[model samples]
Target: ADTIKIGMTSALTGPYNEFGEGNRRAVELAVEQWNAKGGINGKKIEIAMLLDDQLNPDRAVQNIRAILDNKDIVGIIGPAGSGPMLAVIDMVQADGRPYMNPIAQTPVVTYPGEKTGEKPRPNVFSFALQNDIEAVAMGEYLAKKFKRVGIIHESTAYGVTGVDYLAASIAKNGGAKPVATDSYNQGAQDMTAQVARMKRANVDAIAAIGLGKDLAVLRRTMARLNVNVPLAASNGALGQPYQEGAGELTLGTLGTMIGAFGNPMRAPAADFAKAYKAKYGTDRWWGNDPENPQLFMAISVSNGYDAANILFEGIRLANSTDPKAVIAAIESIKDYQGVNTAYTFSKERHHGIETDGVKVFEYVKKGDKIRLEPIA
Candidate 1:
């Protein structure tokens, strides 16, 4: 029997360790579940995962190159953060191997090939929505609720790209020009200066794009300066520790999430949450909800499961370990449902969800539990 090997790279030790670890565990669980069901066509699926600390792009490229050296690997999963994924995009494309991004949110990963005279790499696909979609959704939500908005993002590619998309989206919708736009260096701890500037601008709301630590810094700084403005955070703000530290500061803040708690309307959403909690003995954080009984510990897990499902489907359709055929099968998929969202792929669009698929969640503290309200 021929076995299918999939390669995955993640930041298991660096700042984004939480996401990487969660995603790794999720992938593992998905593989286990699939294998228990007789493994893809009687051939067990094997995951070859590499941990790169701090999402080092160079290290990611090196790891992926090594995986490519092994011709047995039929496909690849991720390198977690957008920066690391971008660093290795060319390498993966050049190898002509099927690759699925479980969590990298930047549009560049999918959109660049479309614009650069290179067609959308049929071999590369992603499960998450693009940054542009999330940005547009968030921007429209904020524009309707707030009068003036301020923007702040880290100076890295992820941060800069998000800021660019969000600012443009907001302006196009006739929203206020960003009252204050500032960029901070990655891993910077002090955001007091930026907070002070935004406070002075008296913006009605703020759209923040950065990691958990940076979010914590911003929240504490804002508290110290007594700057009170509704915050609309990027999906990266879905961190338990940061939310805990922010405490009352995050009240009424809005965020976009790939997953959600039980959607009363969707049976799959509700069932997945129930099964996830029962199996793990922990609540699932759907990025949007702050009081979902569990912290943001299982996002990567969800991502992993989604990625694995896609991989198995691709293999089942391809019926062989051949990368070229698998890539074609993946690109041809339509209306495939997963743990999170329904996916449709083509040569042009690699990600699954459209802009409207995103859920806008606002945090509200009620009694001892934080709750999320879906905004129309």
Candidate 2:
């Protein structure tokens, strides 16, 4: 059987297993759909190496190397976290294999290299650069609503990145100055002290910049303290884990999100999401939070399908399995529509998602419907 094997590494265990499984299932559905259609000139596509880095850099590095061991594998889809991606990216670059980021949105993933180092990292493309969009849009939107915004986020790269963009967004838009900035360590419980500090600052709003549980803690703490300022977050806080952690607590929470495959939006996203659920069985395709059983579109369920489709589209255009050919084809794409956003790529920008599709959305649960909604 002529086959093209793609490699994937996910945090299939530890804290991020749900996301890992979601990534796997999305990739699975994509491969299945493609194969049913006779797949890239009679070559069936299969996931070659599936490894779990468990969010560890060493494990991710080792896992990525294992995928490269097979010469027949044309490209890769993962290593979901930023640290994991960073650890192994050079190896993927050294081999000229296409590394598509489905979840990780770290700026440096495809960003310019330090000094004379490679920029955009050859053969690397990403669709989930939500962080960039979230920062600016969240900042500007919050500024439009509130004159003084406070930040209470974790001190990690993911949280810090959102804050960095918020700072830039405010700088460019000139609406709100940060009234108070507070940080918590990873996995810290009892944000009573932090929330109290923001309340004392008399900030108009709070922008949370950490993972879901932490954001939930901030929200819950604020409610208990009777602080009424709206709590907002960027794209990072609008996912299954956030919902699971926050439960009914997350409804009506504000976050920034991108428009994607759903009704009321133009081509690709709406059609793709519908087609995907039908083919994969809606019960299985859209993943739900274990804490809350509503099927919401997280990266694994919502966006990864787009990543696979985009990569395969590039490969289809090239009509060859060679990574260089596929890479060249991807760079040639202009205004190509997908479920998430209209993508464009070039030598400088490997991440194809544009800010045009980004919008201020509220995370509201409404019975298997897409949780993020464009706010008025």
Candidate 3:
């Protein structure tokens, strides 16, 4: 074959499509860029296996198993959801292929546990901001400003562990336990019951962990029930769905995301923005401004771009596509600059982005345009 094959699985057709589609485009851009200038070892790079996980862990497992069946696929770009990523990571590890996880924010994808003694999965390299980092940031912020905080999150590993970490952070930072906690299944429609409970508790602030669609629904439910409290949410809250779905209600909503897309954008981010516009034009992932893409969507887009390039660099360094070799080469990477973060990996450290790379953002309406601005 004249191609070095790769595989990708993500939520390409559901509410999280912005993340999945954006990741696909960014990876494709990286592949095209590599292929245009002669690919690895004179073989063109191709995403030979592409599947839609629909943000389901079981489907993500099936997707990875299918890719594993093909011996030619040397690497994997993991699915978007935390459940999906966590489900497929061990399979990729067992199969001995490098998994470039660009989206999932859960720490369990790489680390076996949250404690200091836990080990990282050798083959799973995380390129997104992990939940611990964002949890601490959100926890510290909320603890400092709000009293009688409430929580509502998806009933999944992402949400459960996120709340645990957030609670621990808040407690360590001298805040009381959440006044109320509630959970809803991912993609489930109604959260009115949860909102009513928060209202009853007289929670001064609410923190959430879920996708943008769910956040929008929560905001809508809050408005409908006349519960007017500030919301502090996970990274997914910065997605277009939250802003577009909640509309004016989105104003003043606070969320966490990587700082890569902030103003006075760095050269790596600016270059990615320019290249993305030239290739994909604009869509839901683009920000209100035609030139500036959405901050969180930019993270999704750059995740794949950075991962693919980093994978290729590892391959080049190893001079072979053997999965073990690629893994070792990747572990050797140090401060390899990319659009998302300045990546560094080692045998002990599989996650790329650090705590400092994450930041809090607030949604604001400037005249007719709605955009998230960095909270300095």
Candidate 4:
């Protein structure tokens, strides 16, 4: 069987590779499984090009251009961060090849014409959770239980994005909009006033957003002020840095995340979890040495695997090797299930991840390890 070439580009050698390693592994596994199964239409699949974009736009373009030059490469799976993906998206579109991004959080990546009120780029689809979607995800869940919630976010665009979406979603889902919507500066050391204001409202819960550090400051501020209200923060605010620092204050706080990494009970995800540990171990990741301590990949590995399978499934469905046909076939998908999310794509929609799959995870501490336990 002649190999059908595929492409991948990510920050394989830069500040972003902690995010890169999981992608690298997932793509490899998808290809390996396909090849073992005798491949699509009697063709063995190849991850023909794996480029290191180094988180630089120019470098990403140069790398993607090299990949495009190969000609046999039919589609691409990454270049994970939005920065590098932004650099190469137009080029891939110009060439009419599909690009599937797994972890680029920017909403505009698929909706290239969003700010201009234009149509989303048809050839681009994302598996990553977007800024607006995650907020709606949390709000819908919180709305089912809480009648009144407080909105708090950093004044920055990142936080503001979460604030606006969550407010509308809370209203739509039967919860009243924030009794107090507040903002704080990035890296502001104290939030005594902001925390006190939310406490005064007696809101049923708090929907907060900020940098991981600022969110940590938020949790600490609330604890100090004895606000005693459950807080649901942004996906942007979930990370080990904030988790470790919040102590008991972070416990039982609800938040959104794309992965259910450590929980063995989370069905198909549990399957991928075992596979990932077998392949890479729980140690360090990336580079020549697997000793770098970027364990954050545990949260991302399966999404990458799902992204790869989606790309391969598109190729299989199209079956002709024609680029445009393959793009159509990819769009033909709906209710295609994977480890964590159900994908549905169409001519009008490119992102397959649904807010339905996004769930609230509680910060559960067991021994020294922090876990994002999906709430029942």
Candidate 5:
């Protein structure tokens, strides 16, 4: 039987493994579902996955090259973590193959294509929200919810960019000025001085932008310093260990997530959650609220599915797998709805949605689970 080969790379280990694992599971489910529906264009979908990078960029690039060397593989789905994705953008553009970024949230991925003075690379597209949108959402929420906000972030590119955008956006919105902005090393065990400063400033909120370990450390330090105020965290805060580390402190924290929780009240989302749980044998708490694990995972898989759908639609319209023809067909997609978000792309904008599509949710503990309530 004829088959369409796709490539995927995710971090099944390392600090970001939760995200990597969730995203990979979602992608696997998507591929399984798609194939069961008669496959794409009557061809079986074959996904080739590798996890060697451990979310490291240099290794991700190496793996991407390995995938591209396989002539049968038509496209690539991910490198997973933002650091790795950013490391391989140049390679994807130069490889002359379609590479869809499903879960990289840094702004660099979708940096204005026109500004580069190079023609749009038809092979490259991203379905994830840009850091700018996340920042804007966080800024708006903090401005309205708190009288003063402080910023704490890791020193990595993702951390720096998130803090910068959030601070600028909040300032632009006439919200409270940030009392202080501090940076901590990625694996730092202590944030005593940083938390002390925020407490001294009497900030009503602290915007923390970093991954699981860093976020957990921040929470611990905050508790040790007796800094009790609402915490507005970036998407990375939704990881399992971070939530577990924060314990009771996580209640009342705010997050800006990519998709809605799988509320039984909401149709397809509820159905998706149910199916995911039945297959995995664990309730999909990530999409259920508070943790929002499903939101990020769905974003990745939905984008992968959307990319496949676009490829299939392109092939059907053009009646061939010719790259140019597929590009033309994909360019025609407008208001394309997927399980995650609505996608509309063109020569200029590669990201699926505008900055406003993100929703704000607050974490609250109910019984043994975290429940998400839309911010009022």
Candidate 6:
């Protein structure tokens, strides 16, 4: 074929479809732009496969297995969930393909023993920062403000490790372990038991990390139990759907997010916002303010767009579709401008986004409108 094909696996139709859907649109937009301008060395780029894992670990493995069998795919774009990414990574590592991960903030996905002393998977490069960075920010905030904090999280690898990181960060920041701690399945119907426990413990604040819908459940349950406390959470709790799900409770909720979407947007980000609206119009991922776009959506869109652009640049630099050459080419890249932070990668460092790339924002109400405002 006269096209360069890449494989993608994401949670396209599950609880967190916003992430997958947003990535798809942005990646396709990049493809269209590249194809229009004589793609990578005269060949149009194509997403050979876009499999839906539904954020399930088993489904992710199945999708990646099939993608690995597809000989046409020269590179891969990973999924949105840490569980899914963890489950599928071994297969991708064995296959030795250049894999670009735009989501899934778990550190182990790239570096199994990064905290200790272990090398990162050479084939995997990440655009999303690790959860430890977000956890530290939230923990430090909670430690400074609240004495008794509660914890609730999903039961997956992401949630479990996130709690550990959050707890450690809190302890390091002069706060003790949470007064109350609980876990729930990703799509659990009710979190009343968890909220009730937190209320009984008389926690002054709650720290959480999980899917948006589940976080909404926690908020709603807290309201029912009258356990009013400030919720400091991860990126999952700061999206548009989270706002819609939590309703009035969305106000005053604070969380961590990646990339900078503030006023005076960077030239590349401004260009992305313009091109995205012009091409796709406003959709679910576009958020309430079409002119500015939502913070989480902006992060996802820019990550996807940047991942594709970086991959294409790697292919062009390699001058061949071979995975090894492309991998090395990508590793050599430094300070490549994208809507996200200037992406940099190396043989030892595969994750691009650093602590500086993360920021905290609070949801606020202003004249019948609720939006996230950066916390300086």
Which residue pairs collide in model 6, if any?
none
Give a tens-digit lDDT track for model 1, residues 269-338: 5555555555565532344343353324324556667777888898888887688888778777897767
**Candidate 1 vs candidate 2: which has greater TM-score?**
1
Q: Where in model 1 is the C-alpha error above 4 Å?
A: 113-118, 283-299
C-alpha lDDT of candidate 5 relative to the true structure: 0.70
TM-scores for the candidates: 0.91, 0.87, 0.96, 0.73, 0.88, 0.97
Task: Give the CA lDDT, 0 to 100, for residue 97 in model 6.
Answer: 88
- Cα lDDT of model 5 by residue, 216-272, tens digit: 889878878888888888876666667677877778777887654434224545555
Clashes of each: 2, 3, 0, 1, 2, 0
Please give the ranking of all candidate structures by lDDT, highest first, separated by commas. Answer: 3, 6, 1, 2, 4, 5
Candidate 2 lDDT (Cα, 0 to 1)? 0.72
Query: lDDT per prediction?
Result: 0.73, 0.72, 0.84, 0.72, 0.70, 0.84
Least accurate 10 contiguous residues by lDDT in model 2 = 289-298
Worst 10 residues of 1 by lDDT: 289-298
Of 1 and 3, the candidate ahead on lDDT is 3
Model 2 reaches what TM-score against the true structure? 0.87
Instruction: Name the regions of candidate 5 deviating beyond 4 angstroms.
Output: 112-121, 262-267, 283-318, 367-369
Candidate 3 per-residue lDDT over residues 1-376, each given as its tens digit:
6688899988888887888888999899899988888898677898898899888889998988898898889898989888888777777878878888887877878887664214788787878777787788888888888889999989888899889889989999998889999999987789999999999999999999988888999999999999998999898666878888899999878987888878778899888888888887776676667866778765667888898899988988998899889999998999898887888888888877766877788887788876788887
Candidate 2 lDDT score at position 107:
75
